[PDB]
Amino acid sequence: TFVSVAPGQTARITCGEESLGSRSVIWYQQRPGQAPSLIIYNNNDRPSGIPDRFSGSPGSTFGTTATLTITSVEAGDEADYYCHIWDSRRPTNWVFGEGTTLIVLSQAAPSVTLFPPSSEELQANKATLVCLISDFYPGAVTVAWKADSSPVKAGVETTTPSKYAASSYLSLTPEQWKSHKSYSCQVTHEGSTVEKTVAP
Amino acid sequence: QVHLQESGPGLVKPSETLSLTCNVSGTLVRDNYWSWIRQPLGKQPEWIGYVHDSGDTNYNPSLKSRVHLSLDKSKNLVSLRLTGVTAADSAIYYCATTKHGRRIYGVVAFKEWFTYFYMDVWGKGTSVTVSSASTKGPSVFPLAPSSGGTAALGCLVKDYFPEPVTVSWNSGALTSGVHTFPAVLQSSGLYSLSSVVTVPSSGTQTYICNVNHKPSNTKVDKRVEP
């Protein structure tokens, strides 16, 4: 799931089934592009390097769910969080609990960059226009391409953005590239559309 | 420092056996429990198993008949083999040191005593794609600087399979200003990605992107010039 919070405020993240027996919950944090790292073990013990902003709910009151609380949240805390539940009355869990994405609303509008094909690609008889989109929130954009004024019906590949940054690539032949006056990348974000153009 | 580094083939065909290695430094393998963990794209981690030199070893039941874990004391490494793979086995695979703890109460609560494990040091992970599609090495092209006193500058890594590709700038001596985008999986079934750096426009330093595609044993250094 998702949890959003403002910087300085408190985040709470719920993970796993309601408790049955005595509990030991382990929490992991996963930053974008990184391995999970241990944040809490044995319900509320922290390993080296983890500050007391991070706390876990006791393995305690029967029929309740484990919660990780992060107080005084900073942008560095933005990550996916997973628990691994040990419950004295249940079989060993071999899958971690379903993750929760923590969003820190530091706060939005995209930076767009548009590159023409390289001389080197052109020398290989290929051409790709590269439209780079970054530093935007929330993570919804649509990208459209224009050849002169005409909509492009083919050769466009665009990433689903992630933690946001996104990419769009227009594949063309070298003569298609040289033919038109220009090509444009149009990025539509939160009611507005930002355009950049490129030409031979 | 305890330091784990996984390695593997990047690409495995369906029905083949996946073989991974975890190279360990900063501790001896006999002195730790070891886990393998995998995480499919967009999903949570799944614990594969834990192994110890004592024989105190156990495997995820869902993988029981297909998985083997080993320790090599002579080479200080941990190994995994997973047979009969399919697309469901595609994931990033991680090696981790695994510590053990016990919840201990009064003897009146003996039935509720239990042991738990936590993974305190993880490797960087190795990417495993199970696919019938063949490996393809990338084509790397420079994204030349042209235009706040600052310009952007990058490298296009085009049409490779499978993931992943690593891109660095100046062999690692440029990590600031750097944005390496996540790859796009194209309709061709190949991936492409780009990496960009932001630099002051004034003819000092040289900018080289270093691209490595381990699954195809491809390494490319690309100079990027105006």
Residue numbers in the entry:
A (entry chain L): 8 to 9, 11 to 67, 67A, 67B, 67C, 68 to 95, 95A, 95B, ...
B (entry chain H): 1 to 82, 82A, 82B, 82C, 83 to 100, 100A, 100B, 100C, ...
Quote the study on this structure.
Identified from African donor 17 of the IAVI Protocol G cohort, the PGT121 antibody family consists of three primary members (PGT121, PGT122 and PGT123), and additional antibodies from this donor described recently. At an IC50<50 µg/mL, this family of bnAbs neutralizes 65–70% of HIV-1 isolates and also recognizes an N332-sensitive epitope. One of the main characteristics of the paratope is a 24-residue HCDR3 that forms an extended anti-parallel β-hairpin with either a type-1 β-turn at its tip for PGT121 and PGT123 or a distorted 310-helix at its tip for PGT122.
Notwithstanding, negative-stain electron microscopy (EM) studies enabled characterization of the PGT122 epitope on the soluble HIV-1 SOSIP.664 gp140 trimer at 15 Å resolution. PGT122 interacts with the spike at an approximately 120° angle in relation to the viral membrane surface if the Env trimer threefold axis is aligned perpendicular to the membrane. Combined with a relatively closed structure for the PGT122-SOSIP.664 trimer complex, these data lead us to suggest that the PGT121 antibody family effects HIV-1 neutralization by locking functional Env molecules in a conformation that prevents productive CD4 receptor engagement. These data indicate that PGT121 LysH53, which mediates two H-bonds to a galactose moiety of the biantennary complex glycan in the PGT121 crystal structure, confers complex glycan reactivity.
